[PDB]
Amino acid sequence: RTTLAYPATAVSVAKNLAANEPVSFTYPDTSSPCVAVKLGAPVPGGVGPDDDIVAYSVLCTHMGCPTSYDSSSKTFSCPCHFTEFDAEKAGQMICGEATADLPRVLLRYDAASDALTAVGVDGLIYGRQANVI
Amino acid sequence: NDRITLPPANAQRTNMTCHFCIVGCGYHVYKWPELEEGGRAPEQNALGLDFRKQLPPLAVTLTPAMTNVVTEHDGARYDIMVVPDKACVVNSGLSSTRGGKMASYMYTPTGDGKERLSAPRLYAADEWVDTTWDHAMALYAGLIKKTLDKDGPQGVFFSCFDHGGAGGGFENTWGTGKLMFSAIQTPMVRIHNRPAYNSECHATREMGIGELNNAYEDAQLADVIWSIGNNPYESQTNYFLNHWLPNLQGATTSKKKERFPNENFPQARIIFVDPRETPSVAIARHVAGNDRVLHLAIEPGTDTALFNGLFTYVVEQGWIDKPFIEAHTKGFDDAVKTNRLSLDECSNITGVPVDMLKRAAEWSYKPKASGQAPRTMHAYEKGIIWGNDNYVIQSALLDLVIATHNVGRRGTGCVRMGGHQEGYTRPPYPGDKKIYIDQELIKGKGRIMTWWGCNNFQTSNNAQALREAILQRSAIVKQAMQKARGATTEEMVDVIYEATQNGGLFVTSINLYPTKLAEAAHLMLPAAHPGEMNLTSMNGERRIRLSEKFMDPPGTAMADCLIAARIANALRDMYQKDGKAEMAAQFEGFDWKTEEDAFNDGFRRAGQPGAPAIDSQGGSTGHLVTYDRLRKSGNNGVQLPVVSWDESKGLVGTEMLYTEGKFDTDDGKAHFKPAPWNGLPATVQQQKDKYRFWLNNGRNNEVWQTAYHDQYNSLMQERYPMAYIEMNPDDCKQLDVTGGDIVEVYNDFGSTFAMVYPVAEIKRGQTFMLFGYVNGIQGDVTTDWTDRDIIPYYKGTWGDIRKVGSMSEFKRTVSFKSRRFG
């Protein structure tokens, strides 16, 4: 096999998420903190009925400090060397010292159950040799 | 992808200084066979890190962009990993976003370096084709010989790097310098970033103070740091992060108290002199709090008035070191008279409130309670170097610094923050006149022009007038070559020479890539960068290190000093065969097989018995340095000047200059200079009176220079598809433009384009546009104005803005969110 074996991890149902209110969860294991957020307005790659739910690993890709979500700017901010990533542009680094965008947690949205499930990661999570240890 | 190949425990590791900015962060390059890999257990990989479980924050800097797979000339493939060195005192393991991409910017046939020049390229009248090195040399040396023979050196022009790091360095500056100055002997030479053969630091040097006079450790020991015309978080990242921030955070207080037991050390403070509120000001406030930061948001071009006001005030308050002035300086009383300016007039001119001027002076110069003057490091860069009259601004600033004894004491210094690294060893410039090269080319002078390690189409001031003229003169040479058939090299040399007698100019570019210069060049030669060759250079605290070769250059690309040797030897042989012995002798001294030969011949011969005149940043003890000794020193290298060398102590250097008050002048004293305040130059004032916006310009943290590598990187092109212009939101609203729209920026000097980037921090009537980029060149609107030594006021221009329209794809894909952390 050429692919890693990512778990399928239930996050919540989409209707339970409040606009711009982040949900913390771990994926693909408990040492990998992530945040999902229903942004309120559609963005490329967002899922759910309004194509606005996205999720990311929150460990800064520069040196791994946990980033914080800023609701007023819809960005993730790293306090260590000041990098900031855009949650509305697939983790695009706005300014900073990292050489990779914030890793995106791929979500599946199932209309039959309303469930949001984390099923993969695009980008390499800080501090590991492969996304799945 | 979603995984990385770890270096095996026994992987080859070599030292590499960052290719890019002045800081000169230390890195390691791991190289190992493609099909091998290290294990996750710490003792089974070369990083010594445990990848069997999640690593903690700050444990490593490692992403896929820091890795690559290279293919050697023998066809063997090797994994490479270029990561920062935790033990290097400069960066302590930090990597900026620019140096972190080094593995990605190494040459590979399929990656970001796919388009590296790997063979001589010739524009054969009406098409680009490859050509052989022998032919390129017969043509190039042929034109140089014909021009020397008929016109003399005045017909041979060059614009060449004079810097360190990649595309510079002691080997390369010596090679090119020996060739242009000692062999060809032409005075028609400009430098990569300024249009004449001059210095960015004539005033400070004449006053006796070399611009890199301290250690980065001095930023840790200072009570106050001034950052003047400088955005260090973005432009000297790791010096700001590893040395300035720890001081603001209080992590260096115990060091200060340990060195100076009877001295008070208040919490450190920082003062920014910059018309613009930058990411550096924002971070300083975040870290130190607003009350420990002063942003002197001066009116553009008013630095001289600011410093004259501060100098007048500290003299009136007695906040100067009178014993130091009396024992180690000359010219103080005259400077007090010539530079007199009240705080009220200073405030009126600069726009800075009188209370803030007084607060800056109190924090910086008023004696601490324990008696000593604060240790105030005055750091400056291009906001004043390319400011309103470089010579006068520096005269004003250094007067203030000298009077307050802020050179020579630990925790102080009045230093350039730097651009590229430094690595200068050259013969003296063969002329007595200051020649504005771009103006001479625009006026039709010269037969051949060589851009070497630079791209003035994107970086000259008044760039539009330069490109207009060069494209037209180049076209004349192409049209003349179009008439030929079956012409030997010799006949083509005459055809081209005759075209140059009719307005034409033969253009050559020696570079890593085609660049926009390819729109006019007739010949392009492939060069090699650090890692494809050995290279020495020093950083902003004079720390010289060796970057080690670890891979082959693409195709036939070659170190610049070796291209210079190839040219010199081609010309020597041509003169020998033409029976011109005296001319041939001028080209002796280039029997070099490797770049180390250029190091031995230039840097290591400075001041030695029997050597010719050599201007070297290594000075007369440079011979103590050798590649083997630098290698043993690791990425810590040695701070120049070297004091000694022996097997037991290794190289021993110098941390700070002028600690005994012995300055670099006739009498050993620092010299005060007059600094008249003249307002903006008339050329710039005319644009300001006619147009609405101040067109400030400069660096973006993620983009490196002319984006020669970045233009090929998918993440960089997604984030910055076009040069951007920061605009005040009220100004944007009035003009009906928002993030992602494209505007024309123009004035009497030129017209260019940028994507709008609304920034709340920008002042009304002011803007800031990314300089030297590959899509929307900022320099087209800079003026031709230069100071007395031909230093341009690049930061001094005004123009109007016209909406083109909404670039829907930029709106869909580019973030226009704040780059100021807050």
Ligand SMILES: Nc1nc2c(c(=O)[nH]1)N[C@H]1C(S)=C(S)[C@@H](COP(=O)(O)OP(=O)(O)OC[C@H]3O[C@@H](n4cnc5c(=O)[nH]c(N)nc54)[C@H](O)[C@@H]3O)O[C@H]1N2
């Ligand atoms: N408006 C405005 N203009 C400015 C400035 C500004 O602030 N505002 N800044 C000025 C300053 S400070 C500078 S430094 C200049 C920069 O002006 P340039 O020197 O023209 O720009 P760089 O991108 O540094 O150019 C380096 C070139 O050398 C090539 N190169 C890289 N490595 C090598 C190598 O090993 N060998 C060779 N032969 N070529 C190599 C690169 O591909 C690139 O084309 O711009 C100046 N222009």
Ligand SMILES: Nc1nc2c(c(=O)[nH]1)N[C@H]1C(S)=C(S)[C@@H](COP(=O)(O)OP(=O)(O)OC[C@H]3O[C@@H](n4cnc5c(=O)[nH]c(N)nc54)[C@H](O)[C@@H]3O)O[C@H]1N2
């Ligand atoms: N990220 C990155 N870093 C780099 C480079 C790069 O391309 N990218 N280039 C390197 C090079 S070659 C250089 S030269 C340095 C440049 O380093 P800096 O000089 O620090 O950078 P700039 O952005 O050119 O200009 C610095 C500041 O000058 C201010 N300024 C403009 N006009 C004035 C004025 O009249 N007075 C004053 N006091 N300030 C003014 C601008 O607002 C700007 O913030 O950066 C080096 N490091």
Ligand code: F3S
């Ligand atoms: S990584 Fe490179 S770009 Fe400057 S801050 Fe360090 S030398």
Ligand code: FES
């Ligand atoms: S660890 Fe996030 S900016 Fe360095």
Ligand SMILES: [Ca+2]
């Ligand atoms: Ca133009």
Ligand SMILES: [Ca+2]
């Ligand atoms: Ca913010």
Ligand SMILES: [Hg+2]
């Ligand atoms: Hg200077």
Ligand SMILES: [Hg+2]
């Ligand atoms: Hg706007």
Ligand SMILES: [Hg+2]
């Ligand atoms: Hg920033």
Ligand SMILES: [Mo+4]
């Ligand atoms: Mo520069």
Ligand SMILES: [O]
């Ligand atoms: O520079």
